[PDB]
């Protein structure tokens, strides 16, 4: 049907935007957001993909966990995240978010980031290369590019 | 490159030369290809009150000259 | 030139309007056409409500704002 | 009171803008200057008491030539018969008052 | 009188009442007087325009400069108050009575 | 000479801008006085006409006023062609 | 007719912003020895289009404390003013011609300053209150330096309009009768556009977002175009005011490319300017405008006022 | 009445000296107070007037912003009132708003004096001069006219601005 | 009539711009969502509460100041009078006010904010 290709379209132009203009919030924690510097660092240069970091919640896409969460930080996470308009994408760098990691078994530890947010992209390591976190985020665009939110309306 | 600054900047020449053009076009359209009269003053203002009503059309870009005077 | 073209165009104006105000007012009974508004018999300039006050709006607005409204 | 120093001195500080008929840059009229200039002479030297009676028509013409509720009055009249008159058709207003006028220079 | 005439005045005469009833703000007062001079303002400009007084055109710009000395003053004042009780309300100018 | 001279020269060293605002300023409010083209300024402005020149009416014994823009008599703008 | 030039206009401005938004980025990247924006089409000539669609696609947010008919309407009177700036400008021809060019653009800059300030009100957020203060300190900063600058470079000119400056620098530049001055309105026009060093209203560093902390999505992009424009505007105002190109009647084509490029490098001066130096703390700038500005300021007035009567060279315009 | 632009920008006028009229919050009075100012540069660039009221705009735009600085600082008013958030505040509105409509109604149909005198109508086209003369612009003339004829003028001017600087100084200075 | 044109003409697209804004995207609000910003922790106090401003006779001044440009705006014009050395005194004298104004305040401490 020419609606199907119609929606089809325009969700592949809308998921392209997405993709390309992606705002981090400008939000580290501990030891793996001096790796995610050096992402932004002129050898790699995250601006140059579209990629810019965004202090204000609101005006950000994509918040990046990068270190450990504790428990008296874990509202104050919980809340910047839900203050960032929709749509909006978590990813879990480092050992530290993904699952407690070296601070696992410690009694002022969130043992990973999933209990307090939604995450879609888990970067493995402690800390993450610049390049583990540039592919992750490349694997956060690919994952955009896939969704379909104008097909599901119109099938529904 | 320091030479790839070059396509934005001439994208952004390209975009600003149209507002002037432009504008010196529909002023030559409009008036008849010479120039829109300008009147920062009254007497000036009469002049073109007065053109527009000598020229038998009610335009006052339509000139009359020695061929009135028979 | 334009003093004498002038002072011919605002007569010209005044007599047709004079001629109508006489067309107009037939039958009125106590109305003088022509009558002036000053006590003074020298020539007093038109208000220009009194020159396009019979007239179109088009003409109207031309007259008024013609001047301020043109950039 | 009222101090009149700068008639003893001869100074003029402020009564170059008390009226319009008084030396306005350019030689620029006022609208009303040839009525207030009649007013004026009218009552010159006569006094206040005098002035407000025996100068009462120059003094009216120029108040009419200032806000002309005169000749807003015979203009509103003139423009009610005439459409009481084209209301029910026994008008017809001639072309040149309808746009179409032959212009002059 | 025109219209404008009239809505002028009028507006005039709002800014007047206005400022005549206190409603707990002082700088609300200071408003209506403010409003007052620019009512002012366009009255007279209006009429010098209309009657082609060429050497009145100056006397509005004087007009707003007085304005503004006085705006500055009543500012200055408020301050004042403010620093003795925290609030800018006319209630606690009540120490002085009749 | 001695005193003034060390306290400009110390006001230069710390407050170059205001040295430079009250020389400014001190020229600008001096050298008009001592110029010998401000008259010719003022005589500039009085040329220019703004406003119709009213012919006078002709009683006999007006040698001084033209009887045509041409004619000899009058005011003369040469001065200010070659200015 | 007009809609069309009004149109004309109004869409090539938004076009040039969106791409001085690339240019910018650019600059500064092979300032700082990295390349910028190169993935999103060639030469990265596609990222304004992925920034704009990836803004007005994306949800915006109204806080509940905030007062709702403000915060609509201050971004809708900064981009509305943003445009309008551009209406009295010749280039050779302005699509309005006032007699009063300059004072109409200096007022309404002052009606602009309002939409930062009620978006601070507004936003309800003690981050969203200190910009706007910040923004009515730098206001008071600079409009009576920035005013009698242009008093001043305009005696020469003889007129507010902004037509007889082509006129006026037929044979040379002004930049080459008032440099001292010229330099003052350049910083000024930093201070009313809010760019570094002056930029304090939005200050990342110390504000996290300034006054707009609380705008997301449309609201945001449409102060983020009103800022560049206004950055585009003032810049061709300093082109016209003091770099006067020639003009032939005849040929209006050659007097729009040579303003055109003024303009251009006037604002790739503000880029330039950007990367180089750290923000001005609030008060040092009030301080700066006031007991440095304002004194050679007055004292330049003075002397701008006395030279044409001391060398007999009034300009004519009565 | 042509086009009514004279009467709408008036009828506006008065609207927004209504709303700051009203005694709601010092930010809300500004806003009416900037709407005012602007439909008031309006009305007097209708006339002739444009530089006055350019100049007008001007003064009052950075006055206003003054008055913005010193509300958030002294009249914050934790919940701050609109005119409908408040009962007096919203009466009085309502009151001037009809107490507008009503007189501009009895003005219009009717020809009735409110303190001085009647009024007809028909437009403000009628009041006008049809000056047709000059290089220059009467306005720019009158008020450049400051300068040479009204010296006394710019001398006690002068001195109120620099009084007026002296006088804030004492006056805040406290202790 | 233009200038009326041009003001609608931009007010109209700024206007469909922001409803274009809220009126495209999928929109979710909650209360979390909405709350005041200030670094993840929920304020204090509240932004009505009184700022103070070290600045305010700084201010007035600009207040004072504003008018003193006012009446220097139609100083372009009044160059044309044949009264040059009248027109010259009063806005040398103007300006030299004006200047007397700045030191007196400069002296007295008034340009220093407040502590
Ligand atoms: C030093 O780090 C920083 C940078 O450097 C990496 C920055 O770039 C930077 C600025 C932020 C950038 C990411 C720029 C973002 C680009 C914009 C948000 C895009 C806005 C452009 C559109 C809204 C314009 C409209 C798009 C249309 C195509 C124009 C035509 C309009 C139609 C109606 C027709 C900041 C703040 C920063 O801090
Ligand atoms: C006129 C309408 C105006 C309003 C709407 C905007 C109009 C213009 C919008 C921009 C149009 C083009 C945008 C997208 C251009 C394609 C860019 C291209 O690179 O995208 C590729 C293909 O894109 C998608 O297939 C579709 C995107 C565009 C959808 C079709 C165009 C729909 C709009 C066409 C214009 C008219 C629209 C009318 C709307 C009313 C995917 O690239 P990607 O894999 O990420 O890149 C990875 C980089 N690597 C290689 C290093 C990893
Ligand atoms: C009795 C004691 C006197 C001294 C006491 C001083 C206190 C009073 C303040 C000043 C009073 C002096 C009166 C000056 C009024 C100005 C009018 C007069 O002087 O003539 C003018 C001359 O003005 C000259 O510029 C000289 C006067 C300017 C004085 C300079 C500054 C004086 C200020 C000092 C006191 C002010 C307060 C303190 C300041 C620090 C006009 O000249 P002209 O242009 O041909 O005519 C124009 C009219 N046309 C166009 C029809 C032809
Ligand atoms: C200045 C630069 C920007 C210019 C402003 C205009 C930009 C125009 C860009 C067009 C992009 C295409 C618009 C599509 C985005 C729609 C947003 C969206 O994703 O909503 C998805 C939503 C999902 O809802 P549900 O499946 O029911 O689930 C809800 C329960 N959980 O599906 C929809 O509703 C989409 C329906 C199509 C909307 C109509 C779009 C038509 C275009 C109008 C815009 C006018 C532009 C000119
Ligand atoms: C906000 C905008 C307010 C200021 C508008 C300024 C317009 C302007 O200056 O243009 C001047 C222009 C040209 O005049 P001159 O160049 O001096 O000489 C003419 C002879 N050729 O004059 C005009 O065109 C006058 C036409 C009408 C004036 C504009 C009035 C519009 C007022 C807008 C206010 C909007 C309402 C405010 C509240 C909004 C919601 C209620
Ligand atoms: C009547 C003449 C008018 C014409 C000239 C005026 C033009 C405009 C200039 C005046 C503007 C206002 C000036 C205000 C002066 C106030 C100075 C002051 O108080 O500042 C002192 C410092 O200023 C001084 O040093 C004292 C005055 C310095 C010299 C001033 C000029 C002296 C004469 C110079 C010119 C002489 C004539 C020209 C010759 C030039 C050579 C060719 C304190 O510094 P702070 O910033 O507060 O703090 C610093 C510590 N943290
Ligand atoms: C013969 C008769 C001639 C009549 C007199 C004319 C001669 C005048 C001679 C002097 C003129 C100099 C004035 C130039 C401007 C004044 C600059 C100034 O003095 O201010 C600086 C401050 O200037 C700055 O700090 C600027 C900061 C911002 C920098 C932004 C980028 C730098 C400039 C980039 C290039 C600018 C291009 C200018 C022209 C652009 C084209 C229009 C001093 O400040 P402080 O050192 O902090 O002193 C205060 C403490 N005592
Ligand atoms: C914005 C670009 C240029 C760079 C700078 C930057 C990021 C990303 C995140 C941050 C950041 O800098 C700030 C300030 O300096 C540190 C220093 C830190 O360690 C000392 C630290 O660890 C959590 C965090 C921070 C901030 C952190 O949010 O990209
Ligand atoms: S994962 Fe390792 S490097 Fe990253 S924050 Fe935790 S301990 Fe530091």
Same mark, same amino acid.
């Given at each position: 049907?020419?609606?199907?290709?119609?929606?089809?379209?325009?969700?592949?132009?809308?998921?392209?935007?997405?993709?390309?203009?992606?705002?981090?919030? @400008?939000?580290?924690?501990?030891?793996?957001?001096?790796?995610?510097?050096?992402?932004?660092?002129?050898?790699?240069?995250?601006?140059?993909?579209?990629?810019?970091?965004?202090?204000?919640?609101?005006?950000?896409?994509?918040?990046?966990?990068?270190?450990?969460?504790?428990?008296?930080?874990?509202?104050?996470?919980?809340?910047?995240?839900?203050?960032?308009?929709?749509?909006?994408?978590?990813?879990?760098?480092?050992?530290?978010?993904?699952?407690?990691?070296?601070?696992?078994?410690?009694?002022?530890?969130?043992?990973?980031?999933?209990?307090?947010?939604?995450?879609?992209?888990?970067?493995?390591?402690?800390?993450?290369?610049?390049?583990?976190?540039?592919?992750?985020?490349?694997?956060?665009?690919?994952?955009?590019?896939?969704?379909?939110?104008?097909?599901?309306?119109?099938?529904? | 490159?320091?030479?790839?600054?070059?396509?934005?900047?001439?994208?952004?020449?390209?975009?600003?030369?149209?507002?002037?053009?432009?504008?010196?076009?529909?002023?030559?359209?409009?008036?008849?290809?010479?120039?829109?009269?300008?009147?920062?003053?009254?007497?000036?203002?009469?002049?073109?009150?007065?053109?527009?009503?000598?020229?038998?059309?009610?335009?006052?870009?339509?000139?009359?000259?020695?061929?009135?005077?028979? | 030139?334009?003093?004498?073209?002038?002072?011919?165009?605002?007569?010209?104006?005044?007599?047709?309007?004079?001629?109508?105000?006489?067309?107009?007012?037939?039958?009125?009974?106590d109305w003088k056409?022509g009558e002036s508004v000053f006590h003074t018999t020298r020539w007093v300039t038109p208000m220009?409500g009194e020159?396009?006050?019979?007239?179109?709006?088009?003409?109207?607005?031309?007259?008024?704002?013609?001047?301020?409204?043109?950039? | 009171?009222?101090?009149?120093?700068?008639?003893?001195?001869?100074?003029?500080?402020?009564?170059?803008?008390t009226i319009q008929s008084?030396?306005?840059?350019?030689?620029?009229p006022g609208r009303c200057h040839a009525f207030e200039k009649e007013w004026i002479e009218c009552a010159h030297g006569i006094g206040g008491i005098r002035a407000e009676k025996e100068c009462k028509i120059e003094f009216d013409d120029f108040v009419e030539c200032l806000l002309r509720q005169k000749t807003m009055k015979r203009l509103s009249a003139?423009?009610?018969?005439?459409?009481?008159?084209?209301?029910?058709?026994?008008?017809?207003?001639?072309?040149?008052?309808?746009?179409?006028?032959?212009?002059?220079? | 009188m025109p219209?404008?005439y009239?809505?002028?005045?009028?507006?005039?005469?709002?800014?007047?009442?206005?400022?005549?009833?206190?409603?707990?703000?002082?700088?609300?007062?200071?408003?209506?007087?403010?409003?007052?001079?620019?009512?002012?303002?366009?009255?007279?400009?209006?009429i010098?325009?209309n009657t082609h007084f060429?050497?009145?055109?100056?006397?509005?710009?004087?007009?707003?400069?007085?304005?503004?000395?006085?705006?500055?003053?009543?500012?200055?004042?408020?301050?004042?108050?403010?620093? @003795?009780?925290?609030?800018?309300?006319?209630?606690?100018?009540?120490?002085?009575?009749? | 000479?001695?005193?003034?001279?060390?306290?400009?020269?110390?006001?230069?060293?710390?407050?170059?801008?205001?040295?430079?605002?009250?020389?400014?300023?001190?020229?600008?409010?001096?050298?008009?006085?001592?110029?010998?083209?401000?008259?010719?300024?003022?005589?500039?402005?009085?040329?220019?006409?703004?406003?119709?020149?009213?012919?006078?009416?002709?009683?006999?014994?007006?040698?001084?006023?033209?009887?045509?823009?041409?004619?000899?008599?009058?005011?003369?703008?040469?001065?200010?062609?070659?200015? | 007719?007009?809609?069309?030039?009004?149109?004309?206009?109004?869409?090539?401005?938004?076009?040039?912003?969106?791409?001085?938004?690339?240019?910018?980025?650019?600059?500064?990247?092979?300032?700082?020895?990295?390349?910028?924006?190169?993935?999103?089409?060639?030469?990265?000539?596609?990222?304004?289009?992925?920034?704009?669609?990836?803004?007005?696609?994306?949800?915006?947010?109204?806080?509940?404390?905030?007062?709702?008919?403000?915060?609509?309407?201050?971004?809708?009177?900064?981009?509305?003013?943003?445009? @309008?700036?551009?209406?009295?400008?010749?280039?050779?021809?302005?699509?309005?011609?006032?007699?009063?060019?300059?004072?109409?653009?200096?007022?309404?800059?002052?009606?602009?300053?309002?939409?930062?300030?009620?978006?601070?009100?507004?936003?309800?957020?003690?981050?969203?209150?200190?910009?706007?203060?910040?923004?009515?300190?730098?206001?008071?900063?600079?409009?009576?330096?920035?005013?009698?600058?242009?008093?001043?470079?305009?005696?020469?000119?003889?007129?507010?309009?902004?037509?007889?400056?082509?006129?006026?620098?037929?044979?040379?530049?002004?930049?080459?009768?008032?440099?001292?001055?010229?330099?003052?309105?350049?910083?000024?026009?930093?201070?009313?556009?809010?760019?570094?060093?002056?930029?304090?209203?939005?200050?990342?560093?110390?504000?996290?977002?300034?006054?707009?902390?609380?705008?997301?999505?449309?609201?945001?992009?449409?102060?983020?175009?009103?800022?560049?424009?206004?950055?585009?505007?003032?810049?061709?105002?300093?082109?016209?005011?003091?770099?006067?190109?020639?003009?032939?009647?005849?040929?209006?084509?050659?007097?729009?490319?040579?303003?055109?490029?003024?303009?251009?490098?006037?604002?790739?001066?503000?880029?330039?300017?950007?990367?180089?130096?750290?923000?001005?703390?609030?008060?040092?700038?009030?301080?700066?405008?006031?007991?440095?500005?304002?004194?050679?300021?007055?004292?330049?007035?003075?002397?701008?006022?006395?030279?044409?009567?001391?060398?007999?060279?009034?300009?004519?315009?009565? | 009445?042509?086009?009514?632009?004279?009467?709408?920008?008036?009828?506006?006028?008065?609207?927004?000296?209504?709303?700051?009229?009203?005694?709601?919050?010092?930010?809300?009075?500004?806003?009416?107070?900037?709407?005012?100012?602007?439909?008031?540069?309006?009305?007097?660039?209708?006339?002739?007037?444009?530089?006055?009221?350019?100049?007008?705009?001007?003064?009052?735009?950075?006055?206003?912003?003054?008055?913005?600085?010193?509300?958030?600082?002294?009249?914050?008013?934790?919940?701050?009132?609109?005119?409908?958030?408040?009962?007096?505040?919203?009466?009085?509105?309502?009151?001037?708003?009809?107490?507008?409509?009503?007189?501009?109604?009895?003005?219009?149909?009717?020809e009735?004096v409110?303190?001085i005198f009647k009024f007809n109508?028909?437009?403000?086209?009628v009041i006008?001069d049809?000056?047709?003369?000059?290089?220059?612009?009467?306005?720019?003339?009158?008020?450049?006219?400051?300068?040479?004829?009204?010296?006394?003028?710019?001398?006690?001017?002068?001195?109120?601005?620099?009084?007026?600087?002296?006088?804030?100084?004492?006056?805040?200075?406290?202790? | 009539?233009?200038?009326?044109?041009?003001?609608?003409?931009?007010?109209?697209?700024?206007?469909?711009?922001?409803?274009?804004?809220?009126?495209?995207?999928?929109?979710?609000?909650?209360?979390?969502?909405?709350?005041?910003?200030?670094?993840?922790?929920?304020?204090?106090?509240?932004?009505?509460?009184?700022?103070?401003?070290?600045?305010?006779?700084?201010?007035?001044?600009?207040?004072?100041?504003?008018?003193?440009?006012?009446?220097?705006?139609?100083?372009?014009?009044?160059?044309?009078?044949?009264?040059?050395?009248?027109?010259? @005194?009063?806005?040398?004298?103007?300006?030299?006010?004006?200047?007397?104004?700045?030191?007196?305040?400069?002296?007295?401490?008034?340009?220093?904010?407040?502590?």
């Open positions: 049907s020419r609606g199907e290709y119609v929606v089809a379209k325009l969700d592949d132009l809308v998921n392209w935007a997405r993709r390309s203009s992606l705002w981090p919030m @400008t939000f580290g924690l501990a030891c793996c957001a001096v790796e995610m510097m050096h992402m932004a660092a002129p050898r790699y240069d995250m601006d140059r993909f579209g990629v810019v970091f965004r202090a204000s919640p609101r005006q950000s896409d994509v918040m990046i966990v990068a270190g450990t969460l504790t428990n008296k930080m874990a509202p104050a996470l919980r809340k910047v995240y839900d203050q960032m308009p929709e749509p909006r994408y978590v990813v879990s760098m480092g050992s530290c978010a993904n699952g407690g990691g070296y601070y696992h078994y410690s009694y002022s530890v969130v043992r990973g980031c999933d209990r307090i947010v939604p995450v879609d992209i888990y970067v493995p390591g402690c800390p993450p290369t610049a390049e583990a976190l540039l592919y992750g985020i490349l694997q956060l665009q690919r994952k955009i590019k896939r969704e379909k939110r104008l097909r599901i309306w119109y099938r529904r | 490159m320091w030479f790839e600054i070059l396509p934005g900047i001439a994208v952004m020449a390209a975009c600003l030369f149209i507002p002037g053009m432009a504008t010196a076009h529909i002023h030559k359209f409009t008036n008849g290809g010479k120039e829109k009269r300008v009147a920062h003053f009254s007497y000036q203002w009469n002049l073109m009150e007065r053109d527009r009503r000598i020229s038998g059309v009610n335009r006052y870009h339509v000139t009359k000259g020695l061929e009135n005077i028979d | 030139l334009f003093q004498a073209e002038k002072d011919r165009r605002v007569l010209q104006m005044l007599r047709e309007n004079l001629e109508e105000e006489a067309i107009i007012m037939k039958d009125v009974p056409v220009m020159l396009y006050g019979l007239r179109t709006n088009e003409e109207i607005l031309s007259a008024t704002y013609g001047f301020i409204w043109y950039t | 009171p009222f101090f009149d120093v700068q008639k003893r001195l001869g100074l003029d500080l402020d009564r170059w803008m008084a030396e306005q840059p350019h030689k620029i003139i423009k009610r018969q005439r459409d009481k008159l084209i209301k029910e058709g026994k008008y017809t207003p001639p072309p040149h008052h309808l746009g179409k006028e032959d212009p002059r220079p | 219209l404008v009239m809505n002028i005045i009028m507006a005039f005469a709002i800014a007047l009442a206005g400022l005549l009833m206190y409603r707990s703000h002082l700088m609300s007062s200071l408003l209506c007087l403010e409003g007052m001079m620019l009512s002012l303002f366009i009255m007279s400009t209006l010098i325009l060429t050497l009145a055109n100056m006397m509005p710009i004087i007009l707003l400069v007085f304005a503004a000395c006085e705006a500055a003053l009543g500012l200055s004042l408020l301050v004042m108050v403010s620093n @003795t009780y925290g609030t800018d309300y006319v209630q606690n100018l009540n120490l002085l009575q009749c | 000479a001695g005193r003034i001279a060390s306290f400009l020269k110390n006001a230069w060293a710390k407050e170059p801008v205001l040295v430079a605002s009250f020389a400014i300023g001190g020229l600008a409010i001096i050298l008009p006085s001592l110029s010998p083209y401000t008259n010719y300024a003022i005589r500039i402005n009085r040329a220019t006409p703004y406003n119709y020149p009213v012919p006078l009416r002709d009683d006999g014994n007006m040698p001084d006023v033209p009887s045509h823009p041409q004619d000899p008599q009058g005011p003369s703008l040469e001065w200010l062609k070659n200015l | 007719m007009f809609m069309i030039n009004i149109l004309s206009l109004i869409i090539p401005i938004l076009l040039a912003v969106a791409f001085l938004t690339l240019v910018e980025r650019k600059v500064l990247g092979y300032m700082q020895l990295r390349k910028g924006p190169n993935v999103v089409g060639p030469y990265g000539l596609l990222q304004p289009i992925a920034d704009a669609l990836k803004l007005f696609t994306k949800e915006p947010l109204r806080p509940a404390t905030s007062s709702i008919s403000m915060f609509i309407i201050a971004p809708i009177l900064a981009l509305s003013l943003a445009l @309008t700036m551009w209406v009295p400008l010749p280039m050779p021809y302005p699509l309005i011609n006032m007699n009063l060019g300059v004072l109409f653009m200096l007022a309404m800059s002052s009606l602009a300053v309002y939409s930062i300030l009620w978006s601070g009100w507004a936003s309800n957020s003690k981050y969203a209150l200190i910009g706007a203060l910040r923004a009515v300190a730098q206001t008071i900063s600079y409009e009576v330096t920035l005013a009698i600058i242009l008093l001043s470079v305009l005696l020469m000119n003889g007129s507010y309009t902004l037509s007889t400056l082509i006129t006026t620098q037929e044979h040379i530049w002004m930049i080459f009768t008032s440099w001292p001055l010229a330099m003052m309105w350049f910083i000024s026009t930093l201070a009313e556009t809010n760019r570094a060093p002056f930029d304090l209203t939005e200050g990342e560093s110390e504000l996290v977002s300034g006054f707009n902390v609380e705008y997301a999505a449309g609201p945001f992009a449409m102060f983020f175009m009103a800022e560049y424009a206004n950055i585009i505007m003032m810049n061709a105002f300093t082109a016209i005011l003091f770099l006067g190109a020639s003009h032939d009647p005849h040929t209006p084509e050659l007097y729009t490319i040579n303003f055109v490029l003024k303009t251009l490098a006037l604002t790739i001066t503000f880029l330039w300017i950007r990367a180089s130096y750290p923000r001005f703390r609030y008060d040092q700038l009030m301080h700066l405008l006031w007991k440095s500005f304002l004194p050679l300021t007055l004292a330049l007035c003075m002397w701008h006022i006395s030279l044409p009567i001391m060398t007999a060279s009034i300009p004519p315009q009565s | 009445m042509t086009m009514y632009i004279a009467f709408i920008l008036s009828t506006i006028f008065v609207i927004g000296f209504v709303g700051f009229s009203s005694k709601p919050s010092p930010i809300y009075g500004g806003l009416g107070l900037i709407v005012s100012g602007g439909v008031g540069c309006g009305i007097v660039l209708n006339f002739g007037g444009s530089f006055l009221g350019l100049m007008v705009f001007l003064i009052y735009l950075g006055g206003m912003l003054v008055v913005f600085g010193y509300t958030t600082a002294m009249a914050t008013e934790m919940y701050p009132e609109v005119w409908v958030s408040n009962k007096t505040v919203f009466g009085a509105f309502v009151s001037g708003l009809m107490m507008e409509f009503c007189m501009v109604y009895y003005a219009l149909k009717e009735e409110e303190i109508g028909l437009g403000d086209w006008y049809t000056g047709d003369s000059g290089f220059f612009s009467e306005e720019a003339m009158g008020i450049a006219a400051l300068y040479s004829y009204g010296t006394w003028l710019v001398i006690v001017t002068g001195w109120s601005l620099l009084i007026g600087v002296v006088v804030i100084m004492e006056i805040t200075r406290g202790n | 009539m233009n200038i009326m044109l041009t003001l609608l003409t931009n007010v109209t697209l700024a206007s469909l711009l922001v409803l274009i804004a809220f009126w495209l995207p999928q929109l979710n609000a909650y209360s979390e969502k909405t709350s005041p910003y200030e670094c993840g922790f929920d304020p204090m106090g509240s932004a009505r509460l009184p700022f103070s401003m070290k600045f305010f006779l700084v201010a007035i001044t600009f207040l004072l100041f504003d008018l003193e440009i006012a009446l220097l705006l139609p100083l372009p014009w009044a160059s044309q009078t044949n009264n040059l050395k009248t027109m010259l @005194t009063m806005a040398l004298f103007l300006l030299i006010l004006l200047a007397a104004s700045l030191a007196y305040e400069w002296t007295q401490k008034g340009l220093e904010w407040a502590e």
